[PDB]
Symmetry: C5
Subunit: 399 residues, 5 copies
């Protein structure tokens, strides 16, 4: 029986007089240089209404003290050892974009070496407010800024450095949960110096993460209802307006766009500066089919069984030949005296009815020619609108 | 051998018989004059249904006690030193408007000086109540209350002061996230007094904060749908009511306006005094399309193939010389005796049918003139209300 | 060097052997009385589906112990002193209607006096269940119950009293947050006693809070939509049913009334005893428009070109000659054989068509007369129901 | 000066050498007997989508101690004494159905007797997972298992016993919050000895709580729109299909059932066993009005100006002579040669129009007889199905 | 007298100089192996949008100690003993894929043996992020991962092993709550060796849990409404398009299917991969009723009183007789001269009307033949799509 019980001789030796209130150095003029390694793991939820961001990052620590040194000689060759966190000095590195306390797993153990180098592997999910931008909403990048800093100390007590090469944290192809909502290309760290006056300067440092959304599910959620609405009203332009159900088709598909516009408004607020640049594509298409049903009401107004004023020849000998010669399909197009008064009144009434019928035939013929030319012009206009859509999307296939 | 271990000697010297429970003074009659300072950082969310405000500010504290003092000589000339917070005296400054406990990240270290001055850097989230005004809804100036006061001690024990000039916190345009939803005009602190009875007076000192909404999301949300509904029904009056699908147009758009009034009800609540002035614009425009539906149902009632009483000349020859020529165009308009009874029996029915046709022509002509004049009057009324609305709205845009 | 550092001498004197677990008295047969002070500060959230009430109360405590007495004179005229709460005896008073732990900020300081009285200002959030009855839906009053009691103590251990006069807490119109949803008329404290058996008797005292909903924020959207639906269908009765768009207006507003019932159903439920009987007005209004479209289908069935027989004479003579005078001004409704046979064959067909036209004229004339009759009857019923509704609203303009 | 300050001498005699970690027995072969009393307060929310149940329990814990016995006489006759809970032995009575830790107000005090028993009046809220059944939807009864057990101890350590008779638990006339969603029938406790291994036997026992719904909101709320849809299409079968708006009425109420069916899609869940039987009664009456719009499209297909010939004799003797008679009222019904060539085409065209008019009269007469007989058969069918649903709800409602 | 109180002597013996900070062996070079025993209890919530998994598991631990040993001799042969968890060594191993810390029930008691092994029965409610797939939406398998790992320690101190056979945890069908949203098939554990560099390795161990959906709720919520509104339009193809209500019927249930396609984006998949397999059967169905609307407007455009010429015989003798012969049965279709001259214009007008009527008869005859042939072709296409759908669905249902 000798005086070698276990490896708890170190906890008997240097865990009796050491406390956590005082800063473990000898000369107070030399700062405690700390190092930061950031391995991002996953993001959870983006938000622009409350301007808040939720993420989950791994967190490494590297500092060096002076009260926790002993020799590897005659302590049974021990080098590293676990020690609880509530008995050593703990710094206060935190971002200054807090909105709430993030619930983090509480690990109780940290490292210590024989020369004074410690390790602190602990996880934390930080909730944060950051800058947002939606000026190109399906093709977006977010220049967000995380700022590790000391909330209460200065340059002279804690200096934040980085432990490894900045290329190794810029080229971080490490463990990241894919198949989510977003991607990242690279992570850009930067050291920064910030003073506010003489002899009160704090140790800030900046991060620049950039986040990139997949334009895949939002395409199948938003884009194609516009394109089959365009297919169905291009195919539904073709009914003749002499019945009256064409304006019924117009009011029912504008009611369809109305309920679709109620259901699509709950995508992004962008209440501050952000203009819905994708909403311009909606509103110019809505303007063109608004003037389409305006000319629908116009051509229903012109073509009707009215028995009114005769059509003018100036738009009959000039306007008709201008719209037929350029289009492909045009076509060409006493007792015996009482018997005479009766049949004369009968033939006068019948020729008046036949004249009104031929005038109404002329009205519907002019309306049909106008409908055909407007069919050609409107298909040319929607094909120009489709190629205007395509000529903006054709750049970003390679980017 | 020098006996000097570290700067731990000062902490082990003064933390021997010090307790955090007692209020640290030498004379108990002199009040501990404390000083506070406000660094506003962020606002989070509003709710006018529950009358609650959620924000996030940075916060500072200042006091001077008479037990945290020693000589700055012969201790390696140290001036400031970190100390834990749960071993010294902590005040209880709080607001009188708590509805919930905001989760706040603690800072386990505070400063001390050689003459007894301290420093307390800690943030804490403010979930508070605020009397909100909803009379002028899009152009709203608000006025909340953040009463930083004590909870037990009076003026004779704890007196609160400021730290810097009130102009420097009135023009506080420090670190503050932009691109949110509200700006601030100024922050106005003022020191007051409030005693409920004799020998009891607390330290009340308000912080009047003023926020202002950005009227940009509500415009693109619900202002222009009204104006293209206006261009739709203005260009959609123009179909003739002789068919009957104009009634279908009118029922479909008041169904659309009704369902858009349905969905917008559970979007923006306002329950302080009642309905805002924005609902005046809703009630006048629904009155406009109600009287529009009244006139359409009136002109469908007047113009119909009815075979009823002849049109009166007192509204025929009068209205052609009162409205038409003054506003519209001048578009004014046994072999014989037993055999010839069949022609009489035919011509009686023919002249009856022709007379009913000419009377129905007169009915539709009077209806066309009334439709034209009411269309012109309604367009003038809409233009007058539009120029009135823009000449009452164009003031707030020019500062 | 006198033997007085500070007032820490008392804080080390009577905190040397004072325990925190035993109830501080001299004899165990003497109950210690406590006091009750309740300030109805503000409400947070009401609910009837989960049956939970959430509010915040400024609350005070008062009791008297016998171990904390010392003389003021010879201890430098000290009367009051702050002391931590985790070193003294704390009672366990709490209501027995909790559903959740309300987050409340802790208060680490209480008073102490030299005669032995203490003073505890301790707020706590009330999230709790209560008896709610919302039978009278717009004009309601709730007799909710709060039951202050000890959890395990008896009358023989402690006792519950009230501090000031009960009139001063009954008329306690203190600091109260207005401009929300619920007012505060009065509260009613009442001391009771609930002894369940012999030698196990508990001490309780009640609070019957009286709160009243504002009939302004929901009354708008639950009253005037029905009002302009009434003005819409009253102005929409005007068209004749001969065109076929009156049934279109009828199906359109029944679809609007149905989707209005869809949006209004999920507002406030009542599942056990209380009924939605403010919707008895809703069920009589839907009975009104159901019988309205029923007589619409009836008059479309009676009036149509269906080619039926001559109508009933006795119901025609009493309607056209009598009932019209009741309701309005009445309205006063080989050559001999081979030649004439063709004229007679044309004449029989023409006179058959003319007789069918005159019979159909009689059909829609009787239809118009009956339309005017039940139109006047239904407008009399609508004005009677409207004056009944406004006088039943006018009962409650008393207090 | 007598040697008694207060009754603190017993606490000084007990709490000097008593550790809370050891199990308070004199021999390890004697298990401790505990007692269970359950008085349930109220249940809050049911959700079978997550299969979760939330309730609040007033429960008691009675166990027996062997280290805290002393004599009452010569210690001033004191019997019942308060003691904190964090200084004595606390068991681990938990259930094996926790999915979320319920927030509970901790009672810091318990009693102690001089015979050797203590009691703990401790609450905790339960967030439990239960097996739910939604087969019989309105009059449902559920069967949940609150299996009280020890999570780590065995029969050789503890033993779960009862305190009073289980008939007084089954006859629980105590405090229960009425006016909610559910109600109580009975509470049935049951002991169940359960072992899993050799010499590894735990202490289980069962609770089978019984709850019953009061169908006063959901029943009438999903009963009213179906029944006025029934009265609406009963009173709306009666308009004639000759106009063309009867199919507009039918598409209107099928769109109404579309929006009512999609608003009822967000209701109580399924897939525990399958769909409830309340959807079978929905889908069969939807199938019968599918047959109703099928016969509308049948009677519109048959009755139309299609320009065909006379119908087959065997079909018109069965439709206009059989079903119009034996089921209802019998609704019976040089120049002389030049003019010889004239008028022949006129009389041929007039007799062609006359025979087409008479054939079309036969068409809509057969259609009217079919409409009348289908009206009779459809009223009999909906009356039979309605009285069947009424009697199958009426016998099943009784007990 | 024997001064042996109880079994508290062994607790006072081994809990005298034992510390929970240092690791509990004598030779530090031997890693203490730990064992893992997992039985999953129930899952709570799945979320493909934020990619998070929520479940509740039962959990066990086993390790070997050298400082908590004693002898069974002369201590009343005691083996089972309770000891608090906050006074012994606790490992730090946890899941590498946490997001949020869930509230877990606290079990402060653990067993201890005399040889040096202990029990640890603690539960935990974990919140993890796992890989999901949304390709096969009704019948999916989820190869998830629950990686147990050491967050802070290496191989040289701890070592994660198993406890029982992997077949007994592979066929683990113990106490589990059925009748939920999912159901599990098997749990596949696997040992894993991870060496990131030289002399720094971690002890990971994998869990490949397998869960499978029962398509009962989403089937009855999704697939049969498509079935019966396709029943509605295949029974609604019956009417001829001459009335003008066939287009209105078609666009009405087109709007119904469109708003049901709007509302089906509530429980749809997320941005993980892209379009699900169920979206193909929806887009081909909307293509079917869009081309149905296209042939509807085509047959309305062809058959209308447009006042055009006779149809061309190039497509009349061949195409119209094709579907009449190779398909079912067809239908085989003194002024002497100045007095009688007032009939030529009359007979010309009547024969012109008769010729236009016969041409329009030819128009709707060709339209009726085209309607019948397209009815046959479309029912053949619907039956082919239905037999393709059931021969694709019959494979996965049989399994
Ligand atoms: C440990 O728990 C036991 C049950 O939770 C508790 O009850 C005891 O149960 C046994 C088994 O039934 C008894 O049985 C009696 O057996 C008779 C036949 O010999 C029969 O006629 C009776 O009806 C009973 O079933 C015990 O009598 C019963 N104990 C009591 C007090 O009722 C044990 O008591 C409990 N042990 C301890 C030490 O608390
Ligand atoms: C609940 O389940 C238990 C299972 O043992 C059974 O004994 C009991 O009868 C059930 N309750 C009812 C009301 O059927």
């Amino acid at each position: 029986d000798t005086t070698q019980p276990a490896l708890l001789r170190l906890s008997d030796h240097l865990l009796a007089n050491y406390k956590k209130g005082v800063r473990p150095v000898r000369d107070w003029r030399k700062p405690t240089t700390v190092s930061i390694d950031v391995i991002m793991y996953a993001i959870l939820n983006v938000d622009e209404k409350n301007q808040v961001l939720t993420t989950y990052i791994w967190y490494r620590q590297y500092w060096t003290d002076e009260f926790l040194q002993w020799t590897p000689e005659d302590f049974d060759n021990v080098t590293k050892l676990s020690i609880p966190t509530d008995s050593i000095w703990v710094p206060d590195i935190l971002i200054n974009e807090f909105v709430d306390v993030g619930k983090s797993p509480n690990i109780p153990y940290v490292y210590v070496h024989h020369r004074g180098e410690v390790q602190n592997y602990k996880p934390l999910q930080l909730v944060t407010a950051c800058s947002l931008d939606i000026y190109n909403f399906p093709f977006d990048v977010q220049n967000c800024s995380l700022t590790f800093t000391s909330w209460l100390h200065t340059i002279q007590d804690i200096n934040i450095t980085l432990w490894r090469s900045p290329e190794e944290v810029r080229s971080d192809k490490s463990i990241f949960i894919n198949q989510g909502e977003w991607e990242l290309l690279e992570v850009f760290p930067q050291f920064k110096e910030f003073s506010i006056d003489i002899s009160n300067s704090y140790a800030e440092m900046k991060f620049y993460v950039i986040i990139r959304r997949r334009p895949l599910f939002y395409a199948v959620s938003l884009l194609l209802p516009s394109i089959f609405l365009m297919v169905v009203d291009i195919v539904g332009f073709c009914l003749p307006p002499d019945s009256g159900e064409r304006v019924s088709f117009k009011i029912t598909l504008l009611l369809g766009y109305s309920v679709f516009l109620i259901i699509v408004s709950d995508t992004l607020p962008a209440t501050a500066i952000g203009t819905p640049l994708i909403g311009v594509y909606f509103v110019v298409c809505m303007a063109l089919l608004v003037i389409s049903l305006a000319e629908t009401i116009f051509i229903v107004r012109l073509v009707h069984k009215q028995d009114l004023q005769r059509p003018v020849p100036d738009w009959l000998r000039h306007l008709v030949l201008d719209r037929i010669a350029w289009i492909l399909c045009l076509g060409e197009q006493l007792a015996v005296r009482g018997l005479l008064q009766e049949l004369s009144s009968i033939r006068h009434f019948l020729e008046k009815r036949d004249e009104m019928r031929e005038v109404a035939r002329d009205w519907l013929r002019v309306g049909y020619v106008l409908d055909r030319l407007l069919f050609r012009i409107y298909l040319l206009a929607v094909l120009a609108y489709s190629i205007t859509l395509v000529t903006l999307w054709s750049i970003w296939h390679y980017s």
